[PDB]
Amino acid sequence: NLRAAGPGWLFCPADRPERFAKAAAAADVVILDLEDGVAEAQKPAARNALRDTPLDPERTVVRINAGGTADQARDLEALAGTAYTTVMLPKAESAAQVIELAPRDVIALVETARGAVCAAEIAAADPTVGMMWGAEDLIATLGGSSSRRADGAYRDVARHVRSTILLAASAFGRLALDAVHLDILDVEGLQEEARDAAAVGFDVTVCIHPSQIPVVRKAYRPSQMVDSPVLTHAETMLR
Amino acid sequence: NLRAAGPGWLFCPADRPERFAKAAAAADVVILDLEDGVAEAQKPAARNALRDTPLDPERTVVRINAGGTADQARDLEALAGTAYTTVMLPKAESAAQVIELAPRDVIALVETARGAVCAAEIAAADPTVGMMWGAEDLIATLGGSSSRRADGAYRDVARHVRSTILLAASAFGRLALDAVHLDILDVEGLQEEARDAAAVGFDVTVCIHPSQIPVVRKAYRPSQMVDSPVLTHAETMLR
Amino acid sequence: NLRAAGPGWLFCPADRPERFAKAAAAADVVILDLEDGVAEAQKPAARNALRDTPLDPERTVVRINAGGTADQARDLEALAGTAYTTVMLPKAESAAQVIELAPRDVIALVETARGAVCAAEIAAADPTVGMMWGAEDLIATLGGSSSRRADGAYRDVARHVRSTILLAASAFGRLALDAVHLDILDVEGLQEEARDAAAVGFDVTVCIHPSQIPVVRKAYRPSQMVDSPVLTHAETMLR
Ligand SMILES: [Mg+2]
Ligand SMILES: [Mg+2]
Ligand SMILES: [Mg+2]
């Protein structure tokens, strides 16, 4: 029941088992990371820590490696010796990549052009329980050099994919996860970004540092003709 | 021939037959509303006023209730005793929801994530003559709390759906209707918004108060290499 | 090998063979234009100049007329007496319009609502090697009057199509070409626009005047948690 946890999710590299307990205490949900947070040479060690140092599987997701990679095959073998049931799929690009992870629950991380183009098909796949987007791999794989303008605001193609993922998730009753704020010390920018995300109906802001969790939890709390939806807005604020 | 009427369309709750004549005098097209403008307990009375107090069916659309609801079934029964041929479908989410309203003409009001994801299929359905988007139900159904930033500008997912509906409508030769400006006294904001909508090729700005109609009509009137399209822009301004 | 040429592409009307040599010297790739750059009465003469005054076919694309037009049929006849292998298809609106140009390579120019709605299908068609978008025909065909706000920034539906084309191109490994800056003397605006385009991974900025080429080439050269994609950003900047 991931929708019952709060909006602050925290990545934690899985080759750092000494930090698992602190990550769990700081965040609503921990994403133990076998992908880009762990160096290729450290991924075997991270798979052992995954088995050796368990966290609450009701509050923990495992980010595996991308479809078709040898690393993902090793990840799923390691996961068999765990109680984790929900995985995050990076570079998610087709419904078939989600379906081959059945019977696990899948959070699809769309961070390439093909995943954006196919977001609705990815969201609709039966194992999907959530959609995330990743600004940095998105820009990297498009061939660009930055996800943000000088003032920290997302560039337009990033805004486009962000909206795409929010709509695709909501169309199929999935959780919607907003992209990470890489500038850890930029609390002001994270504050505005998470408030923006909460305002349009994102369920989660994913973080890469535990200091970001209090900012996210606070942002997801609120500070002319009135129709029925505007009353729903007011009710959403109270909840 | 709704494309021949001006750009100022006005919602009027159908349980207010005393206001029908004033709505018709104020607006280019009246949308008699059986959905969110009328309280659930008042919808039977509104269906009687629909039959009892007719407006010009060439300049009047009836907003019915959403597909699958008992209310929509009662609405279509009431409409059989009228000369209205065009209905507005709220929470429009599939081509099938449009097709089941044949042989009526349908303006699909997309105001949910699923309708945005399926906008092209909805626009392409044979009964469709127009696409509208609804910012407030959109944000409400996504789980968010406001469609606009502090300065009154739409949030990004709203801008995304607005463009989606304009493109889907135009791709299939349909009318494009822009969302309502709920802040009635915010004439400055409506002025900018309707000018923006007219500039990109929206056909209609829908209003919720008759004072908004003169602002919309005025906004839809106009105040380096030149290629063939730039001359079309100039010709569009003159027309 | 169009990806090996630089980012500065230049339209040159094909009824101006006296300017072909200067266009080739100024630009990375020349788009010899049989469509909107040439008046209808001048198109036969332009087809003769196409045969009579050749440019390097490895650095030259021919913009033909739109699918289904008598002009496109005459264009393809003229092209048979040339060594050009790559054409640009204006008002590109379906995969079928691309496929009927086989065995030529095709740069699809999306500049209508239907082409935006079908961009992924157009990009995926086997002859496609590139996607471009055209702001001015886009707004013209939507029924609007300007692609840009007062400050020169694109209106939202233009930003939407721009992102659509970048994502559709990148999803299928195609070149991504950004729209032309019609205000030739607005060097500052072109500078910002091409920098923006290069930053998100556009491959080409198309120009309509040779003075714009140096601005584009310079713009496509570059002036907190670090993950693998941010290192790819840094590597992209160095390249
Ligand atoms: Mg990533
Ligand atoms: Mg509504
Ligand atoms: Mg054009």
Numbering used by the authors:
A (entry chain A), B (entry chain A), C (entry chain A): 2 to 224, 250 to 265
Paper text:
Mtb protein Rv2498c is currently annotated as the β-subunit (CitE) of the heterotrimeric prokaryotic citrate lyase complex involved in TCA cycle cataplerosis. Combining phylogenetic analysis, in vitro enzymatic assays, in vivo Mtb experiments, and X-ray crystallography, we identified Mtb Rv2498c as an essential stereospecific bifunctional β-hydroxyacyl-CoA lyase (β-HAC lyase) that carries out the last step of itaconate dissimilation pathway and confers resistance to itaconate. A systematic evaluation of substrate specificity revealed (R)-HMG-CoA ∼ (S)-citramalyl-CoA >>> (S)-malyl-CoA ∼ β-methylmalyl-CoA as substrates for Rv2498c.
Rv2498c catalyzed the carbon–carbon bond cleavage of (S)-citramalyl-CoA to form pyruvate and Ac-CoA (kcat/Km = 2.3 × 105).
